[PDB]
Enzyme design. Structure first.
Site, short mmCIF file in Angstrom:
data_model
loop_
_atom_site.label_atom_id
_atom_site.label_comp_id
_atom_site.label_asym_id
_atom_site.label_seq_id
_atom_site.Cartn_x
_atom_site.Cartn_y
_atom_site.Cartn_z
N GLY A 106 36.05 -6.94 45.95
CA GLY A 106 35.95 -5.88 44.96
C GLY A 106 35.37 -4.60 45.53
O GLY A 106 35.13 -4.46 46.74
N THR A 107 35.15 -3.64 44.64
CA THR A 107 34.59 -2.36 45.04
C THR A 107 33.11 -2.51 45.38
O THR A 107 32.36 -3.21 44.69
CB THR A 107 34.76 -1.33 43.93
OG1 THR A 107 34.11 -1.79 42.74
CG2 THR A 107 36.24 -1.11 43.63
N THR A 108 32.69 -1.85 46.46
CA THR A 108 31.32 -1.95 46.92
C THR A 108 30.39 -1.12 46.04
O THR A 108 30.79 -0.17 45.37
CB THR A 108 31.21 -1.49 48.38
OG1 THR A 108 29.88 -1.75 48.86
CG2 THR A 108 31.50 0.00 48.50
N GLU A 129 30.95 2.92 44.61
CA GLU A 129 32.19 3.55 45.06
C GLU A 129 33.36 2.84 44.38
O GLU A 129 33.65 1.68 44.68
CB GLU A 129 32.31 3.48 46.58
CG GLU A 129 33.56 4.16 47.13
CD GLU A 129 33.64 4.10 48.64
OE1 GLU A 129 32.74 3.49 49.27
OE2 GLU A 129 34.60 4.67 49.21
N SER A 135 29.56 -5.83 41.80
CA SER A 135 30.65 -5.81 42.78
C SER A 135 31.31 -7.18 42.76
O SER A 135 30.69 -8.18 43.15
CB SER A 135 30.12 -5.47 44.18
OG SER A 135 31.17 -5.49 45.13
#
Lengths: 243, 250, 217, 243, 222, 244, 41, 85
Positions: free
Chosen positions: D30-32, D47, D75
């Site tokens: 996933g997105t950090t 982010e 995340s």
């Protein structure tokens, strides 16, 4: 029928496979700790290991306080450690309101053991992968230490320990009791009991620790507290001076 | 939701038996061996304390519990589920009798209630059978002194004297020729010591052996005086010094 | 004071210092004194945990009764301790009926006095259901008849124990029965029964372990 | 045997769990998201990877705020991340009902801790494959915690997990040596935007988005709100200057 | 029904009468009003005798179980706390008056619980209908540093005062003495202030006075 | 998931039968042998205990026999653990009929209420059926002396002479040719003694390994008397009949 | 099989004394030796 | 074996060895559980090996108990079954 090993059922060898792996879960963290019974009190020590600098030393602890009169130390992964921690605090509160005065040490280790026995017998619940070790000072039998196994079997110990090196640490505490023929430390002051268990831990592990490398719990009569960084470092000063 | 397993873990094997209760009896022989002897003046049961650690305390470990003041109990092995059965036995014994009939149940009726809990684990789903085997011994006003053998499969049988555990093969055979019709309480203790001593491969002392005897009603174990009706409980737990007195007596 | 170590250790020195009569009066003064826990013994004082120390007082003076001439008086001294133990628990009954006889046969004494004491102790087991205590005293009684060198009283107890211990209990104790039986026929110049008894004794010796004193004999 | 990795409650022969390890791999897909802890408060930053141009700018808020004093960023799987805050939202509402004053930071960590522990104890449910980072300003000082899929958590001076976990979190160690005495809340906002671009090397293949939210007692005074106005654009030029 | 208690330095002692009160008609002149919760802890009933002979058996059963699970001595503080929340669960609709007496390894304790769950504490406590007449005699002769013999005479005069001054008490007196060092001492019929003499005429009737209609024998043993 | 660990206790086999019920019938052959006999003036029940020795208590015990009613007896052959569950519920359902209708319960109603319990686990509940079989014998003024038996499947039929347990077909062979309608109570005892002696695994036959509980009718008609033979009375009939 | 083993051990005790005469002394030691191997394990 | 067959091995090996007059071999014989001949040989050797680093010549009683725990454990850490169910 390969599902016989995945749950708790009678094995063709007459044993329990999932219970054998419950003891193996405590060695994943590799945290060595021990507990000894003093004269009028009980002092427990533990090895404090912080992998990353981003961790707050005050937040990370392997010693939890169930009540004012009872301390606790648990080995193994923290999620199964804190799972039984809040369950033990609930049993200590129900005993004060409903039953009577504050709970002693043996009752807390017995109720938490019987709670794990129900989870072990029932196949839809997995057993805890940690070991419950309770230290306190009773008003009748005095200082006592009860170590609750994840299989639900509780038994009293004179000086106990934990971790994969427990068998090497037990030899240190065992040989000391065979020569003096005593079941507890005769030192009345609790300050000398703290430096007593630390001395045998350093010589056994062959490693000199620091103020942030150890957490020393102190259980007195009807009182329990955890030593801070200045109190633990102060004990290491007199150890190097005497020996 | 909670648990999604409603089926029983015990099923009928194609050989005509139940696979769970067959391996349950095997697990009883995987641990410390207990025993007991019934006489005319009382019932004498004995066991051995096996310490997992040399620094453990044998005083905090009690292998002989008390269900009713007149009836004792002893198990074999480590007894993982023994604490669950005793906690559930003391509740059903007082609720169905002390809280209804006002008095404690006899020996024959108590073993039926203890087996009533174990027989449900072999049928009701979500749980597994009890891998422990107890011994119900006590005294009443009709059956007198009687000792019942509780099997892990949920069935109970009366026996004069029996020994179940790792040494159950040799110890049970030795008690056949050592038992007769006329025996005393102290005379039956020497029978238990000669059989148990051969089964102990470790340290032999009074701290590693828990000897429980059922004698007459003791006023010292009662705690109050002035009532001639209740003379005190018959069951008595011998101390560490009193057991060592009869060890050298052989 | 009430310290037992002060009364017992002081009497031990008075034997060689002055005479054994001064130490005897101290031990006899413990019948109405030196209280303890649990129940009483003779009714004058309470002796339970210190009963072993009270028996030691007789064991210490037991070796001193040879010179004084109490051998004839030792007949009734041992059985009087049985009635004193009926008040408190019976856990100390077996020790008194044995440890005394162990030290009673060690010191030199007449053969008539040794037999009558063992026969008196069996009488306490006759009125009761005692089995092991009756068999333990019977095998020790027949041993005393061997020193008298008479086959009438020696074979009477052996033949009774042989027809019992075979199918009954006390299998390891049966080794000493055949060992004593082999000695009786040895004085009668009979090699058929003596060598046959040693076979039955050595047969059970390899099955059930025997102590050093048994294997040496 | 075979199938130890199938269900949840089945332990591995070495005393671990496969389903817990499989949930960790879902966190790195996933997105950090990162975090910064200071004396006055904590700073949250995430982010958000933009897939195509169809996304509407700055209309999506990934950080779900608990009351006014607790922000939560996660995340991992989006559905599993929203269920933790929704469960913690009811715990914060149930606490303030009986206990009056709002729940502090170290207290709120126990509600999410035990709730994830119950999912690992049942075969009918699955553990959360998302790692949620929560914190804020409590009654005394400040605290920051990162909830792992295994339920293990402690105090963190900083927390970062995601595709850039090996990069962004590695830069947090330089922040400790940069300001060992302390860091202001305003400077931590500009430092949080730089850490996103330092770990952007693996995110250069797609479009990104910068969302920063902080809470402290210096300005907001116990109010967790996102950064808007010229303060957000000022931290972008300062962070992109070193890139 | 009149019950009192006296708490001295070495323990606590309580007393009760043998006369149960059903109202103006007294059915039973001899009964034991001192209930046993545990062998080392005694309790005294008052007011309605039906609710006292039940709750004390129900609560006393769980306390005997708690003493066996903990393998310790039951304490008065543990016995009152179980009984305190029990009457509160019923919202006080169950009339009961109980005085929990006994000692423990930590000291001596004396308590009295009301019907709706209120609990009291003191060296001397009295409940029941005759609690008023027995309260005045205690407060006059009570003082500090009471011995074992002085506490028995003080508790006996309280129940004896409720015999003469109250219609709801009489017959004999039962005193239960509890000591820390020794065990419990239950003395039944310790004082017999009321002893009926012999009647003037013998009313025993000769055989055949009352006519019999039909006589039959009912089988009992099968 | 819970579908993998489930052994599917009750499912229809390709042959049209149940797996757990078919295997439960074999467990009867591994237990003691109970043989009932219905005579003209009464009913004679026979049973043999399994795994017996000298250390067994012969004073008061009944493993294979119980009493559910004054006029009704029962013979238990099978697992003892699963038997006590149906026996405890038997006396409850028997007294409920006596508590309401205020009359003695017959055997036909008592068995069909207990059979529905065994039929319940074979349908719903996802549990195992009772692996114990029962033989119900009682007296009634409707059909007269009634002798019935049960099965783990929950079915009951009328039987003049029934044999369950070890060597089922071996015992029924001798019982079919030697059965008569005029057989009295005394002649019914000799039929059970000769059958249990030849069908056992031992050489001789003692009175410690057998259990006999009959139903006798006294001089007063309409009411019978339930009498369980004590070990003193069991060794007496062995000499009079020549079994020894 | 156990009785056949008595024939082997019947003369083993006579080999120690080196005698051609086998009396009941050797048969008694042979029975006790075979019974110990059967009861063991 | 038992305390009989084992004590003949300890006394025989100790003849060629050098021990202290205060050393008691019977203390470890009672604690012997499931041992063999090769295990006993390693105990007497290790007791003499550790004496070099301890600045000793004859084998003391303390070195016998320290070197005994090494070869008594039969598998890894678990002995055989250890104790549990």
């Amino acid at each position: 029928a390969g599902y016989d090993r995945h749950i708790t059922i009678f094995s063709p060898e007459g044993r329990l496979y999932q219970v054998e792996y419950a003891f193996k879960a405590t060695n994943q963290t590799n945290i060595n700790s021990l507990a000894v019974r003093g004269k009028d009190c009980t002092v427990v020590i533990s090895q404090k290991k912080v992998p990353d600098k981003l961790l707050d030393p005050t937040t990370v602890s392997y010693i939890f306080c169930i009540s004012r009169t009872i301390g606790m130390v648990v080995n193994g992964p923290i999620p199964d450690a804190r799972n039984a921690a809040l369950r033990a605090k609930a049993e200590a509160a129900e005993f004060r309101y409903k039953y009577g005065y504050d709970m002693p040490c043996d009752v807390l280790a017995k109720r938490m053991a019987n709670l794990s026995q129900i989870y072990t017998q029932r196949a839809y619940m997995r057993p805890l992968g940690v070991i419950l070790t309770f230290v306190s000072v009773d008003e009748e039998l005095g200082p006592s230490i009860y170590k609750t196994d994840p299989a639900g079997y509780y038994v009293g110990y004179k000086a106990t320990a934990t971790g994969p090196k427990q068998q090497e640490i037990t030899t240190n505490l065992e040989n000391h009791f065979k020569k003096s023929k005593i079941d507890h430390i005769n030192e009345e002051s609790w300050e000398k009991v703290v430096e007593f268990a630390i001395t045998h831990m350093i010589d056994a592990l062959g490693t000199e620790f620091s103020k942030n490398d150890l957490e020393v719990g102190v259980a007195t009569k009807d009182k329990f507290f955890t030593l801070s960084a200045e109190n633990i470092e102060e004990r290491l000063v007199a150890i190097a001076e005497q020996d | 939701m909670t648990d999604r397993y409603s089926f029983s873990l015990t099923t009928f094997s194609p050989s005509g038996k139940l696979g769970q209760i067959d391996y349950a009896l095997t697990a009883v022989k995987q641990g410390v061996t207990s025993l007991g002897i019934k006489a005319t003046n009382g019932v004498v049961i004995a066991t051995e304390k096996k310490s997992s650690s040399p620094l453990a305390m044998s005083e905090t470990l009690s292998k002989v519990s008390l269900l009713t003041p007149d009836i004792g109990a002893v198990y074999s092995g480590m007894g993982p589920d023994y604490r669950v059965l005793v906690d559930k036995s003391r509740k059903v014994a007082h609720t169905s009798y002390k809280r209804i009939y006002g008095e404690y149940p006899p020996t024959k009726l108590l073993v039926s209630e203890v087996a009533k809990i174990m027989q449900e684990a072999t049928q009701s789903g979500g749980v597994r059978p009890f891998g422990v085997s107890l011994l119900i011994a006590g005294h009443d006003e009709f059956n007198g002194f009687s000792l019942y053998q509780v099997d892990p499969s949920g069935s109970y049988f009366p026996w004069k004297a029996t020994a179940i555990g790792k040494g159950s093969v040799a110890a049970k055979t030795f008690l056949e020729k050592r038992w007769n019709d006329e025996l005393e309480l102290e005379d039956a203790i020497h029978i238990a010591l000669l059989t148990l001593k051969e089964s102990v491969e470790g340290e032999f002392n009074g701290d590693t052996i828990e000897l429980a005897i059922i004698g007459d009603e003791n006023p010292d174990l009662l705690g109050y005086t002035g009532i001639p009706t209740d003379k005190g409980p018959r069951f008595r737990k011998l101390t560490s010094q009193e057991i060592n007195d009869r060890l050298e007596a052989l | 004071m009430s310290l037992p170590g002060s009364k017992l250790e002081e009497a031990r020195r008075l034997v060689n210092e002055k005479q054994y009569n001064e130490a005897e009066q101290v031990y006899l003064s413990l019948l109405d004194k030196d209280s303890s826990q649990s129940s009483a013994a003779a009714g004058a004082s309470v002796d339970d945990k210190r009963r072993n120390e009270q028996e030691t007082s007789i064991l210490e003076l037991g070796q001193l009764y040879v010179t004084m001439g109490a051998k004839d008086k030792l007949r009734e001294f041992i059985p009087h301790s049985t009635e004193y133990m009926m008040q408190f628990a019976k856990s100390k009954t077996v020790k008194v009926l044995k440890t005394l006889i162990e030290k009673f046969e060690q010191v030199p004494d007449s053969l008539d006095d040794q037999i009558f004491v063992c026969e008196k102790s069996i009488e306490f087991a006759k009125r009761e259901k005692r089995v092991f205590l009756k068999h333990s005293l019977s095998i020790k009684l027949a041993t005393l008849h061997y020193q008298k060198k008479q086959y009438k009283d020696s074979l009477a107890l052996i033949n009774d124990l042989l027809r019992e211990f075979k199918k009954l209990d006390d299998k390891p104790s049966l080794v000493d029965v055949h060992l004593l039986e082999s000695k009786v026929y040895h004085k009668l110049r009979n090699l058929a029964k003596s060598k046959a008894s040693l076979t039955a004794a050595r047969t059970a010796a390899n099955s059930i372990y025997c102590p050093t004193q048994t294997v040496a004999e | 045997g075979t199938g130890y990795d199938l269900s949840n409650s089945v332990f591995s022969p070495d005393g671990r769990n496969f389903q817990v390890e499989y949930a960790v791999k879902a966190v790195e897909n996933g997105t950090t998201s990162i975090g910064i802890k200071c004396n006055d408060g904590v700073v949250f930053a995430v982010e958000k990877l933009i897939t195509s141009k169809l996304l509407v700018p700055q209309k999506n808020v990934k950080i779900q705020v608990v009351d006014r004093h607790i922000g939560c960023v996660y995340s991992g799987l989006i559905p599993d991340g929203r269920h933790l805050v929704n469960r913690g939202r009811e715990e914060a509402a149930s606490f303030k009902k009986l206990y009056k004053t709002p729940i502090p930071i170290p207290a709120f960590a126990d509600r999410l801790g035990q709730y994830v522990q119950a999912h690992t104890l049942y075969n009918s449910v699955r553990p959360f494959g998302v790692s949620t980072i929560f914190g804020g300003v409590d009654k005394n000082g400040a605290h920051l915690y990162m909830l792992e899929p295994s339920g293990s958590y402690w105090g963190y001076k900083g927390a970062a997990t995601g595709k850039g976990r090996q990069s962004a979190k590695a830069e947090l160690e330089k922040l400790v040596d940069h300001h060992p005495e302390g860091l202001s809340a305003r400077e931590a906002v500009k430092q949080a935007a730089k850490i996103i671009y330092l770990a952007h090397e693996d995110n250069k293949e797609k479009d990104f988005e910068l969302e920063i939210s902080w809470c402290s007692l210096s300005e907001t005074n116990g109010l967790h709100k996102f950064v808007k106005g010229d303060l957000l654009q000022e931290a972008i030029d300062f962070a992109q200057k070193e890139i | 029904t009149t019950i009192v208690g006296v708490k001295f330095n070495n323990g606590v002692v309580i007393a009760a009468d043998t006369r149960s009160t059903q109202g103006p008609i007294v059915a039973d002149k001899n009964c034991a009003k001192l209930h046993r919760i545990s062998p080392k802890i005694w309790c005294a009933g008052a007011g309605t005798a039906a609710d006292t002979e039940a709750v004390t058996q129900l609560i006393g059963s769980n306390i005997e179980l708690h003493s066996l699970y903990t393998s310790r001595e039951p304490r008065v503080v543990s016995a009152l706390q179980m009984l305190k929340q029990h009457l509160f669960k019923y919202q006080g609709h169950i009339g009961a008056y109980l005085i929990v007496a006994g000692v423990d390894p930590t000291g001596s304790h004396l308590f009295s619980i009301h019907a709706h769950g209120s609990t009291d504490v003191g060296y001397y406590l009295s409940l029941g209908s005759g609690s008023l007449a027995a309260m005045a005699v205690l407060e006059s002769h009570w003082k500090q540093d009471l011995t074992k013999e002085e506490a028995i005479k003080l508790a006996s005069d309280a129940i004896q005062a409720g015999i003469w001054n109250d219609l709801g008490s009489g017959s004999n007196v039962d005193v239960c003495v509890m000591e820390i060092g020794k065990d419990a001492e239950y003395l039944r019929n310790y004082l017999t202030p009321n002893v009926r003499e012999e009647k003037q005429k013998s009313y025993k009737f000769p055989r055949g006075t009352t006519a019999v209609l039909k006589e039959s024998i009912v089988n009992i043993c099968d | 998931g819970s579908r993998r660990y489930d052994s599917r206790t009750t499912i229809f086999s390709p042959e049209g039968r149940l797996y757990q019920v078919e295997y439960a019938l074999e467990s009867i052959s591994h237990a003691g042998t109970a043989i009932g006999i219905m005579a003209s003036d009464g009913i004679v029940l026979a049973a043999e205990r399994k795994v017996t020795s000298t250390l067994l208590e012969q004073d008061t015990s009944t493993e294979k026999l119980y009493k559910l009613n004054d006029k009704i007896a029962v013979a238990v052959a099978g697992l003892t653990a699963d038997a006590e569950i149906l026996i405890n519920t038997a006396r409850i359902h028997a007294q409920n009929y006596l508590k309401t209708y205020n009359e003695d319960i017959p055997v036909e109603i008592l068995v069909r209420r207990l059979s529905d319990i065994k039929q319940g686990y074979t349908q719903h509940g996802g549990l195992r059926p009772f692996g114990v079989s029962f033989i119900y014998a009682g007296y009634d003024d409707r059909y007269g002396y009634q002798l019935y038996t049960s099965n783990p499947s929950g079915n009951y039929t009328g039987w003049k002479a029934i044999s369950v347990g070890a060597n089922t077909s071996a015992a029924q062979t001798l019982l079919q040719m030697d059965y008569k309608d005029d057989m009295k109570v005394d002649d019914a005892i000799e039929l059970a003694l000769k059958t249990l002696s030849k069908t056992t695994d031992s050489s001789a036959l003692t009175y410690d390994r057998l259990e006999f509980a009959t139903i006798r009718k006294g001089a007063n008609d309409g009411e019978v008397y339930q009498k369980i033979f004590k070990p003193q009375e069991i060794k007496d009939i062995l000499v009079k009949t020549g079994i020894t | 099989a156990d009785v056949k083993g008595v024939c082997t051990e019947a003369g083993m005790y006579a080999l120690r004394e080196r005698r051609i005469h086998v009396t009941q002394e050797d048969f008694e030691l042979a029975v006790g030796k075979v019974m110990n191997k059967n009861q063991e394990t | 074996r038992d305390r009989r067959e084992r004590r003949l091995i300890f006394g025989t090996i100790a003849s060629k060895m050098s021990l202290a007059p205060e050393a008691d071999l019977d203390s470890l014989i009672i604690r012997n559980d499931s041992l063999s001949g090769a295990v006993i040989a390693a105990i007497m050797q290790e007791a003499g090996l550790r004496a070099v680093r301890k600045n000793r010549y004859v084998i003391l009683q303390s070195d016998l108990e320290e070197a005994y725990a090494t070869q008594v454990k039969t598998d890894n850490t678990v002995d055989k079954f250890d104790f549990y169910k």
